[PDB]
Enzyme design. Sequence first.
Site, PDB file in Angstrom:
ATOM      1  N   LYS E 193       0.660  -1.137  -0.207  1.00  0.00           N
ATOM      2  CA  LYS E 193       0.026   0.107   0.237  1.00  0.00           C
ATOM      3  C   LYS E 193       0.975   1.325  -0.104  1.00  0.00           C
ATOM      4  CE  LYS E 193      -3.349   2.517   2.647  1.00  0.00           C
ATOM      5  NZ  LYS E 193      -4.855   2.745   3.279  1.00  0.00           N
ATOM      6  N   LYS E 236      -2.420  -1.533  -3.552  1.00  0.00           N
ATOM      7  CA  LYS E 236      -3.092  -0.209  -3.464  1.00  0.00           C
ATOM      8  C   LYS E 236      -1.994   0.891  -3.652  1.00  0.00           C
ATOM      9  CE  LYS E 236      -6.246   2.474  -0.557  1.00  0.00           C
ATOM     10  NZ  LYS E 236      -6.578   2.621   1.001  1.00  0.00           N
TER      11      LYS E 236
HETATM   12 ZN   LIG Z   1      -5.375   3.426   7.900  1.00  0.00          ZN
END
Ligand SMILES: [Zn+2]
Lengths: 311, 321, 311, 321, 311, 321
Positions: E193, E236
């Site tokens: 992420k 992501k």
């Molecule tokens: Zn978070």
Amino acid sequence: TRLRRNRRDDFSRRLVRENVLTVDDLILPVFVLDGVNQRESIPSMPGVERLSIDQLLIEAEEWVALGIPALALFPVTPVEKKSLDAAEAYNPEGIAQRATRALRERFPELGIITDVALDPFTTHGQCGILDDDGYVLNDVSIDVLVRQALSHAEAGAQVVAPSDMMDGRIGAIREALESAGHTNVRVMAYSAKYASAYYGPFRDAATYQMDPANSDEALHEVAADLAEGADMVMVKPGMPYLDIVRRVKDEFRAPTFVYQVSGEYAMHMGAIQNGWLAESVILESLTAFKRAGADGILTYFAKQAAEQLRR
Amino acid sequence: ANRAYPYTRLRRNRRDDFSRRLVRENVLTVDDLILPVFVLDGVNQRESIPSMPGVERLSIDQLLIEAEEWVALGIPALALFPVTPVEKKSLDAAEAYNPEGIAQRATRALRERFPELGIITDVALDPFTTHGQCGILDDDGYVLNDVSIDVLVRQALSHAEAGAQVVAPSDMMDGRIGAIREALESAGHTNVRVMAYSAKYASAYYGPFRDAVGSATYQMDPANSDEALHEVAADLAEGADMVMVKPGMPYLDIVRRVKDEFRAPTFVYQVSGEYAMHMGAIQNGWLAESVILESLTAFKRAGADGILTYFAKQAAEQLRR
Amino acid sequence: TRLRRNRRDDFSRRLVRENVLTVDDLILPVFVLDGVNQRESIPSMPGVERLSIDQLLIEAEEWVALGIPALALFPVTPVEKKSLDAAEAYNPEGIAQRATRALRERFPELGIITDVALDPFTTHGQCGILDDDGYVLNDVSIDVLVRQALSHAEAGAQVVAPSDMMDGRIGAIREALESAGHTNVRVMAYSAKYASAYYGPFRDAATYQMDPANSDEALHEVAADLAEGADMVMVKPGMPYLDIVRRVKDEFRAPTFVYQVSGEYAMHMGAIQNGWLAESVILESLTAFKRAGADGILTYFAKQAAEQLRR
Amino acid sequence: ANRAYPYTRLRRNRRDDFSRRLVRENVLTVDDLILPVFVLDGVNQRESIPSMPGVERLSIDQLLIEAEEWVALGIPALALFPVTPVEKKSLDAAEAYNPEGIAQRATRALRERFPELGIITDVALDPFTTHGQCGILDDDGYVLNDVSIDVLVRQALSHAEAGAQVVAPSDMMDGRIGAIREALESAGHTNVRVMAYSAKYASAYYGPFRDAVGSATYQMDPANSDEALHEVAADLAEGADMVMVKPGMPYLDIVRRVKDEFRAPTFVYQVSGEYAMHMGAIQNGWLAESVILESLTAFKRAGADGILTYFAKQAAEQLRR
Amino acid sequence: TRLRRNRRDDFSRRLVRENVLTVDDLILPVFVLDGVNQRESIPSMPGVERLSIDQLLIEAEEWVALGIPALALFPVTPVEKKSLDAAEAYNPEGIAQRATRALRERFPELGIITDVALDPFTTHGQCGILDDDGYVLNDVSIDVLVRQALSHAEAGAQVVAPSDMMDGRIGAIREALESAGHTNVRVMAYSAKYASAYYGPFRDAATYQMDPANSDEALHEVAADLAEGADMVMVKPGMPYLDIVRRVKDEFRAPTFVYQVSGEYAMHMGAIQNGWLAESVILESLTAFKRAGADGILTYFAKQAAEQLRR
Amino acid sequence: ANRAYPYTRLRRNRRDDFSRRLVRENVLTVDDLILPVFVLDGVNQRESIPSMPGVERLSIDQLLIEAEEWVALGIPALALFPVTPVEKKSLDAAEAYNPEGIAQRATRALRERFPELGIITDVALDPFTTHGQCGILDDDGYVLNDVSIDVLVRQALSHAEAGAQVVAPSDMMDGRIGAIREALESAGHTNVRVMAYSAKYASAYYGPFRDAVGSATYQMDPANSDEALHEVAADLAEGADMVMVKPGMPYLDIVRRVKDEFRAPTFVYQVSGEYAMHMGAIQNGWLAESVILESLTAFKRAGADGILTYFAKQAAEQLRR
Ligand SMILES: [Zn+2]
Ligand SMILES: [K+]
Ligand SMILES: [K+]
Ligand SMILES: [K+]
Ligand SMILES: [K+]
Ligand SMILES: [K+]
Ligand SMILES: [K+]
Ligand SMILES: [Mg+2]
Ligand SMILES: [Mg+2]
Ligand SMILES: [Mg+2]
Ligand SMILES: [Mg+2]
Ligand SMILES: [Mg+2]
Ligand SMILES: [Mg+2]
Ligand SMILES: [Zn+2]
Ligand SMILES: [Zn+2]
Ligand SMILES: [Zn+2]
Ligand SMILES: [Zn+2]
Ligand SMILES: [Zn+2]
């Protein structure tokens, strides 16, 4: 494009030469007799003698002068000292432990590699302690192998080489060496040791050894021994298994050793004596090991080769 | 592996000299050494090179004398670099193929006197041009690729005619290895080896060489590594028997990728400035002499089969102890 | 197809350029003297001075202004403070710990990398505590190294860099940092540190360091240090080992560091001063590191290079 | 690795700006930027493009003025895209090789004024055909592969004659890189680079470009990745010096496979619609401006050597802070 | 040989097509409001509404009818319920837990994926509990994340998706789920992420997130999460990171997920509404994910795409 | 990975239909199906095949009727296999290139009526020889490689003239893909695809096909896998656009190696005997019908892009539920 070009002249051949054998690659296995003033020729291995300790120390002067880095000791156990329990394996007065202390004292820079194995000490000759069906018990044998490895380290051996093919023995021996403070005793694992006919002359001097057909399996053998703490790994026998040396070296990139066994030496020497092969075959058989990826070679030819290489 | 401390202790193999020797992965020998030599015109001539302390330019007679020593120490080959009198430097570089050129004479002389000693000639034209650039120039002051190659072919054949067992096109033009290979083949010189200078960079490490011999759009960008593999792949395809990386130590990574990718005879040149910086440091007492062997070991370790090095004689002397 | 085409013009050369060196890649090693108002030139390393803390803080203004991300501290231990037990290594008032606190206070964004090693604090100069045979004990040395690493973390160091080549020290230091709550102190392991002649000038300013011949072995060194918790791994020396940088980066894909040691710097600077090499060699030697796969470079040229790069 | 928490905590390198900088794997620089430019006929002309907010079509005189700025910011090259007057669009696309065409004039003008600035011309015929399809059409309304290529060769040479250091065949016919390479070679233009549009997909992301210039059986299926590697392998074999993936961000995986597989100079085009969707979002206040640098970083991270991007000037401005 | 041949006709194109997007690949993220009879448009995300639970259950009939396999819930926390301790994260009456129980009851075959994260429940908005320097404490945050994951599993969630980027959280959450008997609750780790500008519109609706420049590092992130017990791993953002999706899929051959974030959706929708891009771009952006190696895609376009695919 | 129970429990993804769907690695669609069809001479003719229950030989008019259904279900292509009247079978196989042959007529008819439907013709001569062996025989009773290929070229062109978008040389002679590719190119049929039967084994699974059409030194040894990769590499080099493995399920490993090694369009034929053994088992009630989809899924999973299968219509029907 023509590949014969770099072969045309020795200098080009020398420049492109991929591997070189040196004395740094040679380990001399030696048969050690009990007693004093003993030398015995081995008919199945011409030029090789079993030697008592006093005579081993004398011959070792020349091995050290030639640059041979290490010896691998194989004691010749008196028949009377073999037993069901293999207790002589860990006897501080056994041949191997006496020979180790004597050599470590006299030649402090010479590597000594002892043999961790129960077969020279059992009356039945098998590599371990038998259960009631005649099968070699793995774990119980390892307890005896551990005591043996400890007695070698106490005698001063820089390297212990478990040749037994018991599963897990490398980690069990490592754990004991570490707990006892033998922090730097190297373990040279016989990782891929095959059930082979090439061993015939050593015996003069299947459920645990590997099937000659199996290659992949050798990789799993060596992966376990590295995980369990081996400093070096070894393939035995030698020439008949060079493909195994190559894959072990390529896959693990670890110090890789190979044993040119008694049978390989006998075959070569017999042929040389009959005039069937030139003496240059010795250096060729040794080069093959290096080319295959061996870092070191246990060979009974170590003396002859170190002599040819010194010139 | 699952190798974990304390079961695995990598110091154990290092505890004694014997185990270190047993596990030692690479060893330098004299069979790995190539001595580059600057060759003067004339007779009873030696000149010291200021930016290369301990290295001498040698007239051929002197070269024959030193070579006696080099042959006894087991050095397999020399790389010859003529030092062209300024008179013989022209616009069209014709002294290159002159069969009484220094290179060609030096080659005939060494080939007659030491038959087993390898001679590697330099196929280039920067040493035979007034302008000093690597090939015939056009009107913009830029190296023509193919015009340069018509001359190179001619120089190459003149060397083979002299007995050179290896020619080494150091120019960095494209397609020259094939053009020379084609010319050697059809002329019947089928056993002359071509050692291509495949990955040759635009380096500052060459400073002292220019002082030794009197003298970016073709040489490789130092930042590039993958490019080197494309250069070497073309030269092998063009018939190179051996390929070279130059400079050396600053490009040990290239040596290692080139060896890993092609598994071909791979050579590396420890150039003038590498020699000068080591030697200078040794003379100032800043580094020990054992740095010479260390530097050379590094090439072997990286995958080099042979090393062009001005230290070849000292290294060969040290290896014999 | 012709590879000279993209070289013809600078713009194409710039477009195809595979690596670029920036100031983000530079770590400046610095020699730190005890006392106040001390500056000493090093004859074996022209342009480099040992500096007392007060003078280090002044020079660091310009290093921070140039964008240099971090310093690596190497204290110059007073002779009287060296001992058999290396106790000064963990002295909260030792030079390194004083220098760390001062720099962390004055330049909060500047990375400080301390040296975890016993050699600057032993009377005999070896990287550890000796046993009765004169061999560097591994585990006992690690206990002292652990206390040293803790004293660095307490002083505020964001990175501790164990340079000692003791087996297992990275995990032992990690475990202690984790138990003490120093959760974010980075460990920059000197994984493959070779027994090298290139270190000569640092000393002015074999059983544990690696043999220069060995490549594969470096992979096993770094695999262990990553497993044991290193945040960064390092090769030392530098240029003579770029092949090792390349294989470490290719094999592990981890943050990889390289030390352009004192000898490498001396050689380059001497040649530059004699007019044998152009000054552009500095940026070329630094680019070689990036090209080989280094993420960062400890170099004494860090200031000169950051200046050339800023323009 | 056997890297396990808590011995390994990947946040430690992220704790401070300095360690983040030390471990940062990739960095975008101005040397990675290529500015594509729409070039008008005439003089003192600029036009705004509705579907490309902030981008202007420029007459050559205006192009020369802006280029001053682009050169100072260090942008290494422009990719020229002529905006062909509808009059000059024919059936046989002859305006392509016209040496007073916009491209050829713009090229002569930039090559004279900024000698160091790279110019990459577009070798195609969709901009010179009444029909608007990429090559001469047969009677079924389908692009002929080899007929298209006889024209392309001619356009390519006209660009090299104008001084273009790079031609970029964007057409997606098979075997065209070889045909152009052959024609450039025999005409003596040996240093003109060919940047092949190798993996060019049939994408919806091209919408705004058609608006910019006034205008599936040849372009690649978006679903296919392995196919891209076969396309690029043929273009390298045909002599391409550089290969390109188009569109860009929607195909970052392709960029990464193409770089990993060939280790060749690899380029990617952030096309009109990528620019439009980012810019629109920036103008609506939905995304921050720093998205520009993020988007470009992604290309570098994926393995791109150079990026054709309408953001080139803004990105170059941002990089200089 | 000509690659245009298989492109000439649609049937050949269809035969050689390497990837196909289906509804089985779609996960719909949904914003959930407290209260009853609430629907709110999001200006930064046209066509997307925050929905109270009663209204979520109604809209979910059509999502289930379209074949959408799962929803990912993102609660819209009332300001008053945010605190320093993030206690609402584990509230059995919090929006996410209420929404989970309601959906699990009404649509037993629909997958629910909850968000394990502290940022929607802290007053400062950070992904964890702060220490006294304002830094997100890793381990202490994990204790709260663990309680949250347990409250989701008790509410019936088949999947919990830790989005927080705390080191070790996947193993800590797994251990707790296993100890509590939640043997089959899947953990979808947000492994890689990145600290990204593409998240702007979600916020309307650096020391822990990854630097966009880093690729290799993503591999180490995912290797740890697989070792620690993740059933699925996720990248992501999405499109800007397709290279990361490809390497994660190639290297680990595990179920790989990707999040087409709010910013990506905004950009696409804005362009479509302005007439700059054709609507076919939606299916093209989704195909890119499949082609890159994603098994599933969290996308706000999931409804529109399932509609286009059903026809 | 270091994935270990109980942290890793591979049953968790299998616990619910939704997670199984999310992780499902491969899915069969109608775009993967090719229907092979046996085509009779004449009009209003259908014949049942005893060893292929449910499959009918069809006169062209009947083929046109069924194809209506096949097109509506979305089947992308048919592989045509003519059933040659014994009269038309000769010594020199001239009926092969006859433009009023079944194949050529059936092709013109389907190409006119369903323009979008792909037609894959069989380039072979076993169906047009009295002897029934694959190519012209010499006096020893052994297949001549190159003589066989002069006929094949002619048949291939006759199919392209009929409108066949794909020809499929099933003969297993060496060098035939290049010979046909060369002939198609110079005749101007540049868009006709060649689907090479690359890895075609000497199998017992072909029994029923011989019954369907009325009819070891060339076909591959079932024991060999590496050999298959050498076969496919030669066909790609010779210009094949697609390569095929035959038989199918008994060679799924080959499909997987061929896809992994070349990343090229890879096809597999579920041959007559595979169809017969499944269908027979389904009719005896020994296996469920869902075995059809399982068998086809296996091909996709193994890496096949398209599957030649007699189940194509049933599978397409099942996929639409
Ligand atoms: Zn978070
Ligand atoms: K050795
Ligand atoms: K050599
Ligand atoms: K860096
Ligand atoms: K670049
Ligand atoms: K899926
Ligand atoms: K398919
Ligand atoms: Mg074993
Ligand atoms: Mg070249
Ligand atoms: Mg270590
Ligand atoms: Mg192409
Ligand atoms: Mg993580
Ligand atoms: Mg064939
Ligand atoms: Zn035994
Ligand atoms: Zn030159
Ligand atoms: Zn130290
Ligand atoms: Zn075009
Ligand atoms: Zn046939």
